[PDB]
From Swiss-Prot, chains A, B:
The chain holds residues 220 to 272 of 273 of the full protein. Flagellin is the subunit protein which polymerizes to form the filaments of bacterial flagella. In C.crescentus, the flagellar filament is composed of multiple flagellins of 29 kDa; 27 kDa and 25 kDa. Belongs to the bacterial flagellin family. This is Flagellin FljM. It is found in: Secreted; Bacterial flagellum.
Length: 53, 53
């Protein structure tokens, strides 16, 4: 019983809560796609003054 | 007879009625799977605004 107690304790110290991780993964993936789109939008800005000449 | 009565009293004090526990187990498993589906639907919420950009 004491060994099972130490195993449950080590699991309480280290084990991750994966159900949080799935939601944070989905949010971070959507944020990555939005950041790539924002990078393209920022990249377009330089060409607007090409029409000036 | 007095020992039999004391054992019956201890059983009345601590023992559980498992027939209620069976229906509670079925309802709780169904509620757990429904909560997992609700969690997935909550995780999908962020994706809708990618279409706007």
């Amino acid at each position: 019983k004491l060994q099972d107690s130490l195993d449950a304790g080590v699991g309480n110290l280290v084990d991750a809560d994966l159900a949080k991780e799935s939601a944070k993964l989905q949010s971070l993936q959507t944020k990555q796609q939005l950041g790539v789109q924002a990078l393209s939008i920022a990249n377009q800005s330089s060409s607007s003054i090409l029409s000036l000449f």
